[PDB]
Amino acid sequence: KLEFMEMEKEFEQIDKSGSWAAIYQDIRHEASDFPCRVAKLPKNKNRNRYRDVSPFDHSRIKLHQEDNDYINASLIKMEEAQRSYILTQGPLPNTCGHFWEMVWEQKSRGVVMLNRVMEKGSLKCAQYWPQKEEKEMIFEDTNLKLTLISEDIKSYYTVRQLELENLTTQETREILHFHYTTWPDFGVPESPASFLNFLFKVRESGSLSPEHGPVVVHCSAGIGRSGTFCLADTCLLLMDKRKDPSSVDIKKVLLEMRKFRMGLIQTADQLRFSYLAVIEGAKFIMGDS
Ligand SMILES: COC(=O)c1ccc([C@@](C/C=C/c2ccccc2)(Cc2ccc(C(F)(F)P(=O)(O)O)cc2)n2nnc3ccccc32)cc1
Ligand SMILES: [Cl-]
Incomplete structure (x- = not known):
């Protein structure tokens, strides 16, 4: 029982010794590496938002297009947690069709967005979804209506509800879009509570359920905020299923997740936040709620 005051004690211990950056750099160097040959092909240069962020060849999501099947998106599958996620970058002006094509083909039912489309001091993301109910979007290259x-x-x-329609089969699906709007580039969520609240909300929607395809998670590059979100979610799951919550090593989990997509969690503070959100969140889920 009093095993919760334990992990939060070592958390404050890490905080006391200011060892977050150390642990984080340790993780960056223990992180696995795999090839990203497809991602680096010249024809896919314009499909990558950033020069150095690429999906590994083994876990990349393939589009069912006959021509170019590339999309900077990676499938992260966590066995023990029994959860899968698709992490991708903020859609580019030329890859919005690809993004939704992926959402369709992968049968995802929810999209989690952690970055903002624009502002002034924030990375730009394409407006890949209709802002006005009366102004639907049609992606001619992928024959999809949104x-x-x-x-x-x-x-x-x-929280937005969208309708995605395959203009060919004429089938339509309800897509839930969860947009957390207060998580700055290389920053942390407004607070652990708002982040968790957002997470629990996405959970309760069934968007993460094994019934549907994997949820699609993205921010700008699809690694910092997206990695933090998914790491927190997986770790919470693990602390709930495991008899011994403190047996959950967030560091091992992150390294496990990084085998599917490089750079998950981009700052020492995001790592700290993931520990903090997981401990607090675990307390909530196991504390009557
Ligand atoms: C001035 O613009 C920026 O703020 C900016 C910051 C970092 C970057 C990254 C920096 C590249 C980092 C990296 C490279 C290799 C492995 C792992 C990480 C890409 C990146 C942007 C945003 C994030 C994020 F953390 F905000 P997210 O929450 O959206 O995921 C991550 C990454 N990047 N990718 N290729 C680069 C080439 C030269 C210099 C920087 C480069 C790009 C733009
Ligand atoms: Cl990194």
Whole structure:
């Protein structure tokens, strides 16, 4: 029982010794590496938002296009946690069709967005979804139609319901879009509570359920914020299923996740935040709630 005051004690111990950056750099250097040949092909240069962030060849999501099957997106599968996620970059002006094509083919039912489309001091992301219910979007290259159906705006996040339609089979699917709007580039969420609240919300939607395809998670590069979000989620799952919560080594989990996509969690503070959100979140889930 009193095993929760343990992990939070070593957390404060790490905080006391200011060892976060050390642990984080240790993780960057223990991180596995795999080839990204497809990602680096000249024809896929314009499909990559950033020169140095690429999906590994083994876990990259392949588009069912006959021509070019590339999309900077990676499938992260966590066995013990029993959860899969697709991490991708913020869609580019020329890859919005690819993005939705992937959402369709992969049968995902939810999209989690952790970055903002624009501002001034923030990385730009393409407006890959319709902002107005009356202005649906058609992606000619992927023969898909997208319509905004609902848009519940809250303080730290907006929940939108979209309708994605395969113009060929004429099938339509409800896609839930969870947009956390207060997580700056290379920063942390507004607070652990808002982050968790957002996470629990995405959870309760069933968007992460094994019933549907893997949820799609992205920020700008698809590694810092996306990695933090997924790491927190997986670790919470693990602390809930395991008899011994403190047996969950967030560091091992992150390294495990990095085998599927490079650079997950981009700052020492994000790592700290993941520990903090997981400990607090674990307390909540096991504390009556
Ligand atoms: C001035 O613009 C920026 O703020 C900026 C910061 C970092 C970067 C990264 C920096 C590259 C980092 C990297 C490279 C190799 C392995 C792992 C990480 C890409 C990147 C952007 C944002 C994030 C994030 F953390 F905000 P996310 O939450 O959206 O994921 C991550 C990465 N990047 N990718 N290729 C580069 C080539 C030269 C210099 C920097 C480069 C790009 C732009
Ligand atoms: Cl890194």
